[PDB]
From a paper:
[name] is known to assist the folding process of multiple proteins, many of which are strictly dependent on the [name]. [name] is conditionally essential in [name], allowing a facile phenotypic readout of the [name] loss in cells. In addition, [name] has a well-defined peptide ligand, the “strong binding peptide” (SBP), which binds to [name] without disrupting its activity. Here, we report a novel PROTAC-like approach for the degradation of endogenous untagged proteins in [name] using plasmid-encoded Clp-Interacting Peptidic Protein Erasers ([name]) that directly engage the ubiquitous bacterial ClpXP protease.
[name] were designed by fusing three different components: (i) an anchor that interacts with the proteolytic machinery, (ii) a flexible linker, and (iii) a bait that binds to the target protein. Using a well-characterised peptidic ligand of [name] (SBP) as the bait in an XB-based CLIPPER resulted in progressive loss of [name] upon CLIPPER expression. To better understand the binding topology between [name] and [name], we obtained a structural model of their complex using cryogenic electron microscopy. The resulting electrostatic potential map revealed an additional volume at the top of the [name] barrel lumen, in the region of the [name] apical domain. The low resolution of our experimental map in this region might be due to reduced occupancy and/or flexibility of the GroTAC3 molecule. The additional density attributed to the ligand corresponded to the size and orientation of SBP in the available co-crystal structure. Based on the tracing of the peptide backbone and the positioning of P22 in the middle of SBP, we were able to model the SBP part of GroTAC3 in the corresponding electrostatic potential density. The results clearly confirmed that [name] can effectively bind to the [name] target. However, the XB-linker segment of [name] could not be visualised due to extremely low resolution—suggesting the expected high flexibility and mobility of the unbound remainder of [name] in the absence of ClpX. Similarly, the protein fold determines the degradation potency as ClpXP engages its substrates by either the N- or C-terminus. Both the N- and C-terminus of [name] face the interior of the [name] barrel, making it difficult to engage without first disassembling the multimer.
Author numbering:
A (entry chain B), B (entry chain A): 1 to 525
C (entry chain L): 1 to 136
D (entry chain L): 411 to 525
E (entry chain P), F (entry chain O): 17 to 28
Write the structure that this text describes.
Amino acid sequence: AAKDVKFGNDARVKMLRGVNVLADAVKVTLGPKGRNVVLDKSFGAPTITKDGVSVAREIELEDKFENMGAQMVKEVASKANDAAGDGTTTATVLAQAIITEGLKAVAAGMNPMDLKRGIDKAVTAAVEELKALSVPCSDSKAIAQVGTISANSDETVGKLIAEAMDKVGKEGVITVEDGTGLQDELDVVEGMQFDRGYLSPYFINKPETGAVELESPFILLADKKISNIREMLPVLEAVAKAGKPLLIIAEDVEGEALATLVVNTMRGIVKVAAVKAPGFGDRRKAMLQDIATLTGGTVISEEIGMELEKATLEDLGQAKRVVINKDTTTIIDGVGEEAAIQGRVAQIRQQIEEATSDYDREKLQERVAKLAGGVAVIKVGAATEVEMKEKKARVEDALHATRAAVEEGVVAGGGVALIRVASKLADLRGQNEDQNVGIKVALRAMEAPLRQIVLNCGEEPSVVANTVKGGDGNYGYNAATEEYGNMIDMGILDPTKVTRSALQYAASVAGLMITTECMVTDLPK
Amino acid sequence: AAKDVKFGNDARVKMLRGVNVLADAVKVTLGPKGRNVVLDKSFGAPTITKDGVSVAREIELEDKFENMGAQMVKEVASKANDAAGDGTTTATVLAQAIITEGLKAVAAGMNPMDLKRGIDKAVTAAVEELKALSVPCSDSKAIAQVGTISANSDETVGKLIAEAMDKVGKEGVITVEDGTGLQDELDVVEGMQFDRGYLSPYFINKPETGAVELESPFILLADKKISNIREMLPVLEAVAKAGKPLLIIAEDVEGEALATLVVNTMRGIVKVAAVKAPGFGDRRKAMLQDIATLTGGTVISEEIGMELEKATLEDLGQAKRVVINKDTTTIIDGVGEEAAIQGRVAQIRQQIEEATSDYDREKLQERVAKLAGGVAVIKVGAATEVEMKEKKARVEDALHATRAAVEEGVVAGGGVALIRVASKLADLRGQNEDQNVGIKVALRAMEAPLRQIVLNCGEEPSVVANTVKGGDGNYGYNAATEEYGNMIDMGILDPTKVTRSALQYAASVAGLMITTECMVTDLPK
Amino acid sequence: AAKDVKFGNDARVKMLRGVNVLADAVKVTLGPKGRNVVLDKSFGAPTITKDGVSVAREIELEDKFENMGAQMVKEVASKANDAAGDGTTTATVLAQAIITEGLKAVAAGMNPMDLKRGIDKAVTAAVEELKALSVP
Amino acid sequence: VAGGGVALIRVASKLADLRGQNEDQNVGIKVALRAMEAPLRQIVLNCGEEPSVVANTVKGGDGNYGYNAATEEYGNMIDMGILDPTKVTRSALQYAASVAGLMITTECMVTDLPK
Amino acid sequence: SWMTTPWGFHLP
Amino acid sequence: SWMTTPWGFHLP
């Protein structure tokens, strides 16, 4: 199809328009005083939401180049979403600010490469200052505080999170689950998670959560690149006649093997959901065997000649639940024998004993921790269904926030930390004038989130920004109560990782957009 | 369909517009300071790339004649790509410069044939001067230096390349491969490559690499022009029931025999990939037998009556890997017996002993080298998947660059060598005024790459070009550090073959476009 | 008569266009290698001149705001003419350069008053240096 | 002073360290200094040579070194007779600066209707 | 041409 | 009219 090509200033103008449209749609939802956005559905009443992700998902425009701009900003908004779990709106606001200022500077006639260098230098210095500013949060009381703050100041959620992380460690795997009674329950089961994702989004049976959830499924392990679905057929017949879901851990599911499974799942029969085998090289086989001994199944290796089509139900292991999120899959309460897993961890720690290099020790210790750790299951307790769903959502949000806080600590919320960091870098300079202009662009854009929060609140952004800059430490503006005070003392807290990731991805997309020179799209027809 | 025909100046104007559009899209990515080009995909975020090949692939316009111009330039850009492996952007820039100047001269009223003669004479003299300027690079330290420079100044890649070429010779076959641990591994296996290409691009299972990769496949040898896929059927059933890929070496796969295989591959069943039998005449049969004894299979010759449809799995040989690139196919680690190949090379060297003419000796020595050389397998070592992919890409780029450097030596990079060559030919003259004008056009266009690199860097092209021309030797401008110095000493190096090929193909397309008089396309409707 | 009023960026763009037209007409005659400009008369052969003053006199455009820009530049070209007797083309070239760069900076988002102060300071320092450089 | 725009270039080179009170003032100073090289570039462009190359070559030299467009060569501007009264250049620069400031500070424009 | 198994698999 | 073998070959 014939292509339309735009160069230089025209392409930059189109991208800027698209970015402005998307960011204006999204940023009105920032902060506790966020506005409502009405999204049209195919039928019925339109949905009214205050979530930036939902708004950003629907936005894409009729002009192809403006659509380019919107999609490029959305990409890094999603990237920040999948890194820390929150701050997509903040990242979008920062990206819009940097892109606007940088494109203005470029149109003024500055070298785009020097501007990109200046922005990168400023962002690196800001990351260093932000790491310096962060306070540790590993203390159990801090865990409870973060859990309460995330879950709308609820003590029970914080207590549950603190108990779970005390019982399974700070780095342990914790999974939320629906309870039975009004009392909450926390326990540990034999299971573990590994960093792999679904091959296609088509197996997602939890559209609101964006995850593939299988209850009491079979697991098909294969140390071979699975293709030729004809080989697959018999095990699917055996699984479907048993009325159970299937989770496939294969080296790589090729084409015509994931499409066939996708079609089968959408048509209704079989609830299979394939996933890549974690690791590579001999490590892939070792951890495949570890998963096999965890689930009680047998690894179907073509090297020795299991001949995949000849696999039976006994070959497949079983587990209580499997949850496949965007990048990790968790197996919860596998049916593997306790003696088998105990022997496996004994074998792996023996391998640690005669391990020679530090890499081998580290890897085998990782396997030992994965096998002997288990997963914590939090049973949310409440009276009715709506309370069940609200409690589960609150607990999982608090879990994400607490995990981030444990990872990188906490800083002042409400955009205060970014303002303090920007104030701390007022003397940074580059190699030439354009680099200094880029540094100033980044520092100025670092104050955008607080101004946007204030503007949504209804106050004057400039006055509040100046007042906050005049103060020091955790001094900031509470938009919920429309007052000034110590942000930490009033509970407004933000994980360091969230702000760092938002800033870094905003800077990356801004540099990419600034250095863009030509754009090629399809014809308007 | 009715045709639109354009003559003379109108056709030249349309071609010039198309060439300008394509070259303006491509050239912004030249050099280390290249800009970004945003290409739209069917869905999701648009891809942002700094690679000239990717940009050139998508470019084609709605006007039929401008599309002609763009396609003709793209053709020689690709031709230069497939000859040296790099320099497509440089070739496109040179082609645009020569075409622009030549069309201006033609519109002025000069004889196009004389201009073409002058351009050809200037390019021939430039090739001679460039061969004179090149320095040898066969030394192992030079190999390590080139490998480091190509792979972003990484010592490990250069060491691996140097070790491989020392172990299998300068002209030996070397193939990169994914490793198992973090340590890199290099070894040799019984295998070889021959210069043949896939019949259709539809068997390509590696779109990023543009190659057909089969792991542990069967090989079907046929000393007959394979057609009538009904004859083919039984061996495909036998292969598919075994769950292996297939590589067909036949004299020539006719119509309805490659289309059927293509449809089978896209539908999913069977991973067959046919290829032409290397050589011709009795040489074709001799090297087919050599391949058979290398892979341990049997040549299925219809002359004696194997009756292709009666072939079994035992007739087909096996190999560890086969990789089919654009023009060559490499068989790596065939299962043929070592005694069999040893006896075959003994037989061929015996044939050398009583060989009469020099042609027979040369050909049989070529077969001996191919059989007894083997292929080097480089196992890239790293920790994670992304490092695996980056290391593999870096190693294969360094391998291409080192192979070119060994072939033709190295010259100063950054367009310095072309400028020095052009300065050395300031006295060349033709037979008349138009020939001299063409010579001057070629010499002036020879400075385009350096000017484009400087312009992407942001400096003034004329000032830097004049400063470089004022100097001598390897004096040049480093755009990465924005300074002046000895290009060789600061590591900026270019294989002689890359620049020579870029110049030659640019000249060829420029001459073809200059001598063009009429253009016939389809109607706009 | 009813008036058309333009504010900010639109007015600046119109002025810049008018200045560019006038300066492009005039500056081709600068220096000993100046080009020829053909001016139409009411009758007879058009006059061909290499003088900046003659070219600048005839220039005025149909757009009212671009005409504003051209007239404002012409005014100081004439002012420089009546002060020293020569250098109208040089003054016009300098004015076009400064106006172009300054309007670009203003569109970038700098304070116009500060830009004017900087330009005035630079010009004062330049006048001092030029007086130092002159020989009797 | 030296003609051919040489005096303005030398003056601009002599003021490479001048600074204002803030960033915008420095930007204005740089704008003026950059524009001070326009006459020589325009003369060279009318001559047919490359303005950037000749401007750089003149800036590299010192004193009355300059480019004669009549003979298309380099030399001491005073020795080859290319001279300019100081008042002419001073007045040109001053009035150009005045009109540039007036145009830069302009905010609204009122004219008659197109009809 | 999607072959269907007796147990319902929609083989493409 | 693409004949299909029992093992899945899509004969054209």
